[model samples]
Target: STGSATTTPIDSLDDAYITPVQIGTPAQTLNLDFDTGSSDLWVFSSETTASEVDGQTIYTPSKSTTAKLLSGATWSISYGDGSSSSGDVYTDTVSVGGLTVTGQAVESAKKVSSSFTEDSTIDGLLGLAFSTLNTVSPTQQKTFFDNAKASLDSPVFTADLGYHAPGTYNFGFIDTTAYTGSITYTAVSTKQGFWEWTSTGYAVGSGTFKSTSIDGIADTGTTLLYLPATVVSAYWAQVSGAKSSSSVGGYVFPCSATLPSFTFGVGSARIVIPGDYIDFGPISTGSSSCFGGIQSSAGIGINIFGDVALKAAFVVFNGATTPTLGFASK
Candidate 1:
């Protein structure tokens, strides 16, 4: 029963995007982060300590008749922010868009970091990366995408995000009308369990195209775009009052400064990130300094094409035998 399916428009939360997912037979709906960077479908559950839970909805496996405990299976994951979560595992019916996958692994959180506790908007994360990244111990499990890919009409999913607007996440097949012109594709490297690819070069506004290659991942879970410190410096140099502040850990500029658009090449196609997209927001309420959405990836040691860059185009994450990434202008 392979076919295409489209999810309801995902809500934009400035820093992250969330989509509705139904878990279990009776359908426990939760708004989860659809991340392309990591490969673990984990959630806040009744098993989580009460002190670690906040205003978020907790998934109670006991309430779902279809939920089956995966005995001896456990998972733990740490994020770049130093926050981590760990828990036991369960297998249950999971649905996204209109596609359903029975016996999907759902990691139920027993403990969560404070960062996640304070973020009540997102109940959990559903990973879309390769299954090799799944954190379950003893025996790792396949991701929701991996389980659903075989049943898809096409082993592909697309992420179309927008600035302060709702967006769509389509699976099984691409929506031709969602993008303009033709899609330019590149081979993806899953060595690190990410949707990693290489950019041909970049340009600042109408500036000359610099023929330099940058390796990065298309991470929908991340909030900003991260590039080499050198590339970031070149970008900041274009802003009048931009400065790298120790307090902010990145470049900040006067709110009144004019920001330039950023363009990066993918094969023959070049994707343009609008100037306003770079203007994240004021550092503080009514503050004259604003943080730039583009920052250096020095500490992380890998470039990231996050929401700041993703909102500019329609992205295809092809889960073919030889996985590939496709980019098209919107």
Candidate 2:
């Protein structure tokens, strides 16, 4: 089977793409962040404390005829940004696009961090990373896509994220018309529970490509591109007003600074990010300062090709036995 769903960027992509998903019988539709950096389907639910819940929708398992509790099973997850959520578990029918998977484990939020409780626009997260990354105890739970793979024509999914616009997520097959050229494929190494790969190098402006070996994850969930501090510094060198300021946090530059174009080496294909995209808009709508969407991966646990780099191209998460990443212009 093949299916597709439209995703909307949240707050000009201060957050990644968000999509609607239905859980349980008769369905409770919830807007969730389809994350590729982690595993496990977690959502805010009726179980959350009233004080901790914001204006977001919550899943009430009692209303779903197909919902069942997984006795003593609980899940907890935290992100690099310090946002976190922990919850009780439920086995129910979960649907993505138009595909449904029965007995899918859903972690219902009982507690959430300030970051989550403050975000009223999103209800939860749907992880697309490997099942081994799931936080459930006793046995790791499978992701919604993995649980429904057997019923699909091809064990694959594609993410077409756009900058501040509507993109798409397709399952079971690749849509030929969605991209502009032949896809350049590379083997994926998942030992770290991430869609990890080596980026040959990167460069700013029209300079020669650096041959640095950078290992990183293709994380759809993360909103910015993070690389080594030296590399980040080099990129900053191209922007006259740019600097790493603790007071400003990470890297910052004058809103009017003429930005430089950059690209990542993905095998022989160069995935270029236009200079304008690097300027992550203004620090605020009318502010004179701007935040660099590209930051140092320093202390961030791992380097990542987040949405800042991802939305620039059409990406394929090939789930074939060898697992590979396919990149082409969208």
Candidate 3:
């Protein structure tokens, strides 16, 4: 069938979008990050240590009659940011929006990193990447999308992430009115277990488009847009008083400085990210320095088109026989 769910930013900076997921028999709803860069449906649960748990919802499988232990199964996942979580596995009834997946593998967190514990915004992460990236041993589990794709009207899902407002994630069908013009489709490689693709090129403000292939992943898990150092420097150079500083952690500029729009080519389509979206936020509450949403991918190893880029357009994650990614302006 089909389903739809709303995803809203956890903070004012739009650091991450969280979608509500219902787990178990009686239904324990928890807000989770729908991450396309990783693969695993993990959540904080009763199995987690009290010390490691903070102000967040916890899923208690014992309360659900539909829960069954996945014997001998274990999982561990560490993100690029160093935050990690490991846990035992269970098969339970999981639902998102109106879509239901019975016997879905639900990883119950036994231990979690300080970073995850510190941020109470999200209870866990729902990985949307390929199941090959799952960390569970003995039996790697399929992602929610993978398990539910067969029953869907079409093997596809669309992510409409908003700037500061709430957006939508529609399954099995694409909303015709959600975007403008025609969608530009591009091939996606899942060998790396991510929505990896190449962009034709990019442009800063009103500058000429540089025709080059920039390989990167469309990662909803990540918060920033990371590009080649040269491209990043070129964009920053246009902003007055902008500098890349280690102390500031990335490219920072005066909060009052004039910013330029960033444009990236997807086939013949050019998606433009408004300058306001680039001003991530101030270094501190009262600080005059602000961090940029676009940064260099020098140490990251791979460029990431994160929320900063995805939110600018309507993105379709196609799961057909030959998977493709579709982009269109909203």
Candidate 4:
């Protein structure tokens, strides 16, 4: 049967969103980020030392009699932001919403870097990218979506990621109730197990939309939007005193300046990201300097349409056949 689950942004930490998941027989629950950037269901568990974990809840495998170790198989992963985690592996029934995947591989963390230890809200990550990106060693493992697809009405899932608000992720069946008007479909060019695609150019503020193409990936796990150096500079040129900060790494502009809107072309769809969304939090509360969410994709190999952009559209990650991305206004 087709299923669905809702996720909400972590309080005060508007960067990432999370969903609840039930793992093992006793049904221990945890809130996980449904990331399309990578594949693997990893979490903090009894395997992690007590001192290593902060204020977050830990999953105790011993408490669930259904938890079974995967012999000789372990898992480890590191994010682009430098956060990393290494853990042992287990196989059990993992459930999200009404969907349950038997023998789903669950990576239990034994150690986490300061990036994770310090953040008390996110217990673990639920990867929604292709299974090929799974980090388990010795033998590869299947992602929960891979295991659940067989029973779905159609092999599809939609991500209704909202702007600093709660959103829903529906599996198997598309929820027409979530969006308005038509859903624009764009072909996904997969490489490195990510949803890679070419943008049909972009525009800054009230400027005319450019037709130049840019290579990029739609990544939900990432927090900000990234464009080419020229595009970032163009957007900053509009704001006086806006300069690339050596200390901040990206462009830093006076927080008082009127930021401009950013729009991009996707197939027949146009994603117009608001100016308010472009100004990511602040450099520090005491100063007028603010960090721009849009930055240079230089050295990163590809541009990224992260939460800042995705939150502006209702997204559909379709796994059937050629695999495509659908977007509509929420």
What TM-score would candidate 3 get against the native?
Answer: 0.99
Query: Candidate 4, 100: how far from true, in Å?
Result: 1.1
Top candidate on TM-score is 3
For model 4 the local lDDT of residue 131 reads 89
Q: What TM-score do all the candidates reach, one by one? A: 0.96, 0.97, 0.99, 0.96
**How does each model score on lDDT?**
0.90, 0.89, 0.94, 0.85
lDDT by residue (84-137, candidate 1, tens digit) is 899999999998877899999999999999999988888999999888989999
State the local distance difference test value for candidate 4: 0.85
Q: Candidate 4: misplaced stretches above 4 Å?
A: none
lDDT tens digits, residues 183-203, model 2? Answer: 888879989888998888998
Clashing pairs in 4: none
lDDT of 2 at 83: 90
lDDT of 4 by residue, 236-303 (tens): 89888999987888898998988898888887678888888777667987788988888888858778
Top lDDT hit: 3
Off by over 4 Å in 2: 284-286
Off by over 4 Å in 1: 1-13
